[PDB]
């Protein structure tokens, strides 16, 4: 059977129409068909398949079947193994999909696509057993093992395989598909990390010492010395010195360094303006340092705009905005920008001056916390960010129990101690703020224990309590009960509930620390990619880079590169050979396994018993 | 006798050696400053720090005991954990402290008090020092306070804390207490627990290496303890001018006998390894499958020959 001749588009559509009607793919195709019928022979059509694929990849299946809209039904599929793999993946058939992947040309990209589709469908997950089998798909492992084989083979063709635009997946890069699939374990591969290190250092050699690089950063003229080794490849002298300067000052590591230093400078200036040089409204004018801070934040806004609208390429504006706002650091920045603008606006008026100063203090808090993202560069600091996020989630869930318990205890103690205090603010103080402070050692027994209550001048008159002339007299009717409740609260809260939260923290830390390497390598990938696409200048100076880019656009890649047809075909054949070698080694390993040997021995012993019995009977005939 | 530079490099490679060097330098600087009236207090301060260094130097003798040795390594790794935790702690404390200083004392110009309220007070919150009389308006005393900047700088009266939005200051303090005191402190403690677990898994090996190092260190030391060690030093110098348990040179016959003995021991060890490998389950399975294959082929041939008859 020749699959190239066997699989026509009509045949493929017939296969898509022959879905068992008990699996998720049939339901999804039914929903697509119902939507199409509402908006406007074969039960299902390639339009429905394209829409279903769009709900899992949304960029990869660009005109897989919409190109001709519908293609000729007697025409053979241009990518038969790709189509068969996609069809066998959409319906949770993993063995068949494994076979189709083993016969397919672009296997790393196919495996990453399969892992993405498996996780998205396990998010859909109509059933639960299918969802569990689809959680353990092991396609990212196929991609990782094939790429390990490829990287061990050549280590230079592996990088090109990482960055080349695929032919079977609509010019999508393997790294693009891994990002779409969120394949954290693939990004943690040694080959991917090596390519990331090569991108990180740029023109310099990756073995460059940190001390030499920092010292050359702080002494720019020393870059023309041989202190920093660079990778191979009047007017000439100027050109070569400019080339050396640009190659050093364009590397993502130096851009990162400069951005970190200028962010420290920005925080220092922000703190100076907020704490020492915050002047009255424009009647007495903002200080010059404040205007410098305004310009700095304006350049930050320009950088945000560049990242949200003019990032790297041309897509839908809405798609680019969605990609921008999907990053949590991006929305953190947006919050900081909005807070600064509101603060500045309120500060410009006398009646809102204090509110503006308050909002600006909160904005400094937000910017300082924003500074945290640079810790992903270090293995010992990166994973702790993820730990802190999960631990914040743990705190959020613990807060339900804490709030219920504190409401009960605080209202009971407020009723027992100050039944005649009408003021609501003091009600909430004594009911929640004081019990919360008990957790951290703040136990004011002079307000709770009668024997410790001072002889202060106190009133029982409600009007005098409301007026605030004298503090209310605490009720000591049954003070033993108040003290017993405080003892119980101290035990329960401070030991039991606090250590329940701490045990939750410990479990979270243990779970993240088990996978610390993978998490940090994914973080490092994201940080290196972020600073590789950034302009070489740090804000405020980034205004120069923005102006230069705009002027270049008006007047007139390391990753995701397009290859010549011959080199592309050579790479595809090389990867196919690597996949064949990997599968052959897997088969050989399987054959020599203990279970396989046991099965072979038992079967052959059975055959030997039968044939030896026959031979013995024949001999006994003689 | 080696290269002088090699011996110095070997000396300074030991952390206890550089600890001692720090202690000696501190004592010398302290004594020198103490010799002058204008540097007397600085000398006393440096000598106090030197006592601290010497007392911590005393820790090295704990390697002699199995229950004390490994704890030194645990403490070193835990200090590294603290160093890495300090980045998060410093960033968070800078954010919170500057925000609260701006909210509470926007008119206080003095930088020392800025840094006090921005980092020293929030750090002390971690250890139960929560002065609500400076943060909560309802707990603020009726003390005699000024809003004049000149009077604040002069120090005549304490500055009046700003109570513009005190609910926000209190909410920030509540959030800081939760985040820092529970979350971040227990993140550091979980790091500590992981470090302790990793070292305690290999406690025996670490302590035995420590014991080796300590025994070797005190085997090569002169028999007299300082100050008295001056007598041993003078005796050694006099012996050098006028005129080993480990690392000993053997006669040629005994050396050859030892080499042959070790070769025989290695041969016995390798033979036992080979015998263990042969009788393993996997090897037996491989042998049985291969011989069953051979038996199938040869029995088929024999059966065909019999069927010829
Ligand atoms: C292992 C486990 C640990 C936890 C726990 O169980 C065991 O421990 C138990 C111990 C127990 C507690 C044991 C004892 C008591 C005392 C008892 O009061 C007796 C009531 C009498 C009558 O009403 C009040 O007396 C008098 O009051 C006056 C004030 O009103 C004081 O005058 C002061 O007045 C003014 C003070 O402002 C000022 O003029 C002066 O300062 C002074 O003149 C007198 O001096 C004092 O004599 C109340 C109960 C209490 C606190 C127990 C509570 C429960 C425990 C904590 C257990 C735990 C589960
Ligand atoms: C489970 C979880 C725990 C954590 C938390 O969430 C839930 O708990 C919540 C509880 C909440 C708090 C609940 C209540 C409040 C009170 C509120 O003030 C109301 C504002 C008004 C108006 O501006 C001020 O009032 C008045 O001020 C005056 C001072 O200025 C006082 O006069 C004093 O003046 C001088 C004091 O020097 C002296 O003359 C005397 O001593 C006295 O005359 C009055 O007596 C008082 O009436 C501010 C907010 C706060 C603290 C909440 C903050 C957030 C919580 C902790 C929640 C947690 C997330
Ligand atoms: C963590 C939750 C948030 C929401 C909430 O409980 C904790 O906060 C508390 C703060 C309370 C305020 C505190 C002070 C005052 C001033 C007083 O003159 C009138 C009542 C009012 C507004 C109170 C109304 C009820 C409020 C919002 C409580 C509310 C359930
Ligand atoms: C753990 C870090 C060490 C470094 C540092 O932050 C914590 O220490 C802080 C102590 C600060 C001092 C404290 C007191 C004074 C006296 C005052 O009249 C002038 C300013 C000055 C020197 C301050 C300058 C800034 C300093 C070094 C801060 C500096 C970022
Ligand atoms: C309490 O107020 C009354 C009002 O007359 C006064 O006489 C008395 O001295 C006050 N006591 C205290 C402790 O302030
Ligand atoms: C505060 O200082 C003024 C100066 O006249 C004085 O009259 C007043 O008694 C002082 N109050 C306190 C509480 O020291
Ligand atoms: Ca951003
Ligand atoms: Ca020494």
From Swiss-Prot, chain B:
Disulfide bonds: none annotated. It comes from the Eukaryota. Monovalent cation-selective ion channel activated by intracellular Ca(2+) in a voltage- and temperature-dependent manner. Mediates the transport of Na(+), K(+) and Cs(+) ions equally well. Activated directly by increase in intracellular Ca(2+), but is impermeable to it. The activation mechanism of TRPM5 involves a multistep process. Residues 35-41, 104-112, 154-165 are extracellular. Residues 1-15, 65-73 are cytoplasmic. The gene is trpm5. This is Transient receptor potential cation channel subfamily M member 5. It is found in: Cell membrane. Homotetramer. A motif (Selectivity filter) lies at residues 127-129. The chain crosses the membrane at residues 16-34, 42-64, 74-103, 166-200. Contains two Ca(2+)-binding sites that are allosterically coupled. The binding site in the intracellular domain modulates the voltage dependence and the accessibility of Ca(2+) in the transmembrane domain. It comes from Danio rerio. Residues 113-153 dip into the membrane without crossing it. Ca(2+) 2 binds at residues 17, 20, 217. Belongs to the transient receptor (TC 1.A.4) family. LTrpC subfamily. TRPM5 sub-subfamily.
């Amino acid at each position: 059977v020749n699959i190239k001749q066997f699989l026509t588009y009509g045949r493929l559509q017939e296969l898509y129409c022959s879905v068992s009607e008990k699996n998720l793919l049939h339901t999804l195709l039914l929903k697509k068909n119902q939507e199409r019928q509402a908006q406007l022979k074969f039960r299902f059509t390639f339009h429905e398949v394209s829409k279903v694929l769009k709900d899992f990849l949304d960029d990869t299946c660009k005109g897989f079947y919409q190109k001709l809209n519908l293609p000729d039904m007697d025409r053979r599929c241009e990518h038969p193994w790709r189509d068969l793999f996609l069809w066998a993946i959409l319906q949770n058939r993993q063995e068949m999909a494994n076979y189709f992947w083993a016969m397919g040309p672009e296997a790393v990209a196919a495996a990453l696509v399969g892992c993405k589709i498996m996780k998205e469908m396990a998010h859909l997950a109509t059933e639960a057993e299918s969802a569990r089998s689809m959680k353990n798909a092991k396609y990212e492992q196929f991609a990782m093992d094939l790429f390990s084989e490829c990287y061990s083979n050549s280590e230079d063709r592996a990088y090109s395989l990482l960055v080349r635009k695929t032919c079977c997946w609509s010019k999508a890069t393997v790294l693009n598909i891994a990002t779409l699939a969120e394949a954290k374990c693939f990004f943690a591969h040694d080959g991917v990390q090596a390519l990331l290190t090569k991108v990180w250092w740029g023109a310099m050699r990756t073995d460059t010492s940190i001390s030499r690089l920092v010292l050359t950063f702080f002494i720019p003229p020393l870059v023309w010395t041989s202190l920093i080794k660079f990778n191979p490849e009047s007017a000439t002298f100027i050109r070569v010195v400019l080339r050396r300067w640009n190659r050093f000052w364009s590397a993502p590591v130096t851009v990162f360094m400069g951005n970190v230093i200028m962010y420290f400078a920005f925080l220092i200036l922000f703190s100076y303006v907020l704490l020492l040089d915050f002047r009255p409204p424009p009647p007495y004018g903002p200080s010059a340092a404040e205007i410098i801070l305004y310009f700095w934040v304006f350049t930050l806004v320009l950088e945000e705009i560049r990242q949200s609208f003019f990032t790297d390429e041309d897509m839908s504006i809405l798609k680019k905005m969605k990609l921008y706002v999907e990053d949590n650091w991006n929305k953190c920045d947006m919050v900081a920008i909005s807070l600064f603008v509101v603060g500045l606006s309120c500060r410009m008026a006398m009646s809102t001056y204090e509110a503006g100063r308050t909002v600006l203090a909160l904005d400094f808090m937000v910017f300082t916390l924003r500074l945290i993202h640079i810790f992903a560069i270090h293995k010992q600091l990166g994973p702790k960010i993820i730990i802190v996020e999960r631990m914040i989630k743990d705190v959020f869930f613990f807060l339900f129990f804490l709030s219920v318990w504190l409401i009960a205890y605080g209202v009971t103690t407020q009723a027992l101690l100050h039944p005649n205090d009408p003021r609501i603010d003091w009600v909430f103080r004594r009911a929640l703020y004081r019990p919360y402070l008990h957790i951290f050692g703040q136990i004011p027994l002079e307000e709770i224990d009668a024997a410790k209550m001072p002889d202060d001048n106190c009133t029982t008159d409600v009007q005098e309590i409301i007026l605030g002339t004298l503090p209310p007299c605490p009720n000591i009717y049954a003070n033993w009960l108040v003290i017993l409740l405080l003892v119980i609260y101290l035990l329960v809260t401070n030991v039991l509930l606090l250590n329940l939260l701490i045990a939750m923290f410990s479990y979270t830390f243990q779970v993240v620390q088990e996978n610390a390497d993978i998490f940090w390598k994914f973080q490092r990938y994201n940080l290196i990619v972020e600073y590789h696409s950034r302009p070489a200048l740090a804000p405020p100076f980034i205004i120069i880079s923005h102006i230069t880019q705009a002027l270049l656009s008006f007047i007139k890649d390391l990753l995701e590169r397009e290859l010549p047809s011959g080199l592309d075909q050579k790479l595809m054949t090389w990867e196919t050979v690597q996949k064949e070698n990997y599968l052959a080694k897997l088969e050989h390993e399987h054959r020599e396994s203990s279970g396989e040997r046991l099965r072979y021995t038992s079967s052959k012993v059975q055959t030997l018993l039968r044939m030896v019995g026959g031979f013995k009977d024949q001999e006994k005939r003689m």
